[PDB]
Design a protein around this ligand. Structure first.
Ligand SMILES: [Mg+2]
Ligand SMILES: [Mg+2]
Ligand SMILES: [Mg+2]
Ligand SMILES: [Mg+2]
Ligand SMILES: [Mg+2]
Ligand SMILES: [Mg+2]
Ligand SMILES: [Mg+2]
Lengths: 270, 116
RNA sequence: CAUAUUAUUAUCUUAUUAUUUAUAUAAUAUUUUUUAAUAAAUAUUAUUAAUUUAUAUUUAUUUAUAUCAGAAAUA
RNA sequence: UGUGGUGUAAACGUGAGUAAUUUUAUUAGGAAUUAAUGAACUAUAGAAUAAGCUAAAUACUUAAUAUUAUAUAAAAAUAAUUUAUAUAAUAAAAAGGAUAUAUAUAUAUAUAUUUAUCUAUAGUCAAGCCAAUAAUGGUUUAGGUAGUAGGUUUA
């Protein structure tokens, strides 16, 4: 599990090191010309999925020492995929249980992200959708149900939308769910309706492909079943049902991703 | 002050009795070194006026000798006057109010008058 | 006969520096031929990183000349 | 007590060396006809573009853009110079901060008011080199000098 904790750290040290003395530290043949005139082993391009499970065990700290790097180091900044954004929002809200500080971080570091040619890291399908998915739980749990308080936070969370792409279409259903749960007026310039489109989930898929669909669609499934459970009205759409039923049928093995997070709420609640 | 060439005051006279040359000088040379040119003299002590003459209403006179045509030449080619020299040249009519400063910026009791 | 300082050299030694030959599986950048770990869409194709390769800029190595200064000798 | 800029070639003190190989003084002295040099103020003009590197930058890198030699004639202050033209290359930079507002969608941008940056021309202030004349005593120091004296090239 600490493979990430060591490998990402070494990656960050390598990229934070000055280019004058990178060859003399990291290259093998230059070791002799370094110590006579500490040496670390080479560093190779690092996998996006390596940091995915670093969230599964700190995270605020890692993100802070990570995003404090200079803007013009492209490898450090472009590495963060929006998948990571969704993953860490989800894990923060459910099991790490420090959601507020994470959202404050991501707001400030969004203001910084803008000028690194990484606007896509915030988009509908990996930042907004999960943001309001966690907002619905936030409203339900402690009964935060004021109208203006929720409305202003919705507006601000709409400010932090650096990709105007809304193609899958869950965004508008999420907005409707939020507005009806609270009762405010969902005014969202820029947002537009879209008829929902989710990929089919075959039951004859290869095992690696089965878990690949699982890994891609864990978050969208969490949002889907959350949106179903929070509102019986949202049983209206059968495309909301087709993907969910196919997925939960493919989940006959082991346990739902949903179950663990919902009880992870509880293990922190006490 | 700025620049290589500067119009400034060089001290002459005894202790407690300052007199000055108005000189065009290199910025680096010593204050009392031989300058590029001696433009004039300046006696900072006003001419004494008798008490009866104060009743009359005379103003004490501060004496300045100056070569006006050469001073205008040196101002023209870019020489930079000091603050005291700037004050002296503004009241001689050589320089106008554009050389005044915020601290130095009022009713006129007399008007700058040129005689022959 | 003894002590001291200054200068000179067909002599010896010589920091430093500047020139000067020649050498680097010597380095850092660009050029190739290749080997490595990432990416993405659907066998990859591209990126980052090492191997070999040939032009620059340096260091290490020396060849030669001059050189502070000493030594010896002479005045 | 981090990165940067500007400031210390001046002034101050001293008289060791220095007798002229570059020192001093003088001249209304010169040329090699002293450089696409401004050091730092004037007067005008025009600019102020990209990356890389450092944590960032008016710090450093890399890149973009902006007189001389030829030839043709002209003359004369002529056995050369100067003038004008046409080419060749010149071909060499930079920087932004502080305030206002005005747009739009905190983000950029557009103006301005400030103080800075760079380039070019001229002016100031200034530098480099050479000549002539002069600059103490001892010839019981009378011969000295081999780059020495001169010529021709190259660096
Ligand atoms: Mg000033
Ligand atoms: Mg000195
Ligand atoms: Mg002195
Ligand atoms: Mg002396
Ligand atoms: Mg920059
Ligand atoms: Mg600079
Ligand atoms: Mg000689």
């Amino acid at each position: 599990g600490e493979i990430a904790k060591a490998k990402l750290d070494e990656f960050l040290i390598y990229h934070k090191t000055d280019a004058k003395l990178k060859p003399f530290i990291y290259r093998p043949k230059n070791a002799q010309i370094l110590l006579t005139k500490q040496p670390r082993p080479p560093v190779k391009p690092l996998s996006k999925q390596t940091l995915n499970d670093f969230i599964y065990s700190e995270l605020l700290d890692w993100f802070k020492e990570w995003t404090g790097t200079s803007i013009r180091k492209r490898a450090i900044w472009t590495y963060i995929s929006p998948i990571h954004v969704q993953k860490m929002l989800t894990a923060s809200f459910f099991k790490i249980g420090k959601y507020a500080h994470m959202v404050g971080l991501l707001y400030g570091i969004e203001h910084k992200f803008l000028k690194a040619q990484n606007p896509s890291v915030f988009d509908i399908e990996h930042f907004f959708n999960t943001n309001i998915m966690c907002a619905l739980h936030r409203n339900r749990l402690k009964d935060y149900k004021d109208a203006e308080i929720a409305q202003r936070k919705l507006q601000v969370a709409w400010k932090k939308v650096l990709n105007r792409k809304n193609n899958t279409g869950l965004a508008n259903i999420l907005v409707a769910t939020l507005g009806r749960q609270i009762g405010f007026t969902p005014e969202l310039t820029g947002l537009q309706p879209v008829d929902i489109s989710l990929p089919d989930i075959p039951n004859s898929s290869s095992g690696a492909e089965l878990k690949d669909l699982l890994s891609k669609y864990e978050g969208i499934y969490l949002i889907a079943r959350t949106l179903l459970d929070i509102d019986q009205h949202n049983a209206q759409y059968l495309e909301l049902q087709e993907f969910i039923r196919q997925y939960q049928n493919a989940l006959s093995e082991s346990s739902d991703p949903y179950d663990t997070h919902l009880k992870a709420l509880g293990l922190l609640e006490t | 002050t700025c620049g290589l060439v500067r119009i400034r005051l060089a001290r002459f006279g005894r202790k407690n009795s300052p007199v000055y040359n108005i000189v065009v000088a290199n910025s680096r040379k010593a204050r009392d070194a031989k300058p590029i040119e001696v433009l004039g003299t300046y006696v900072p002590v006003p001419s004494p006026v008798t008490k009866r003459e104060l009743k009359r209403g005379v103003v004490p006179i501060k004496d300045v000798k100056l070569d006006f045509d050469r001073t205008k030449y040196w101002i023209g080619v870019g020489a930079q006057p000091s603050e005291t020299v700037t004050k002296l040249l503004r009241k001689a009519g050589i320089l106008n109010d554009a050389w005044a400063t915020s601290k130095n910026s009022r009713k006129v009791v007399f008007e700058r008058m040129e005689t022959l």
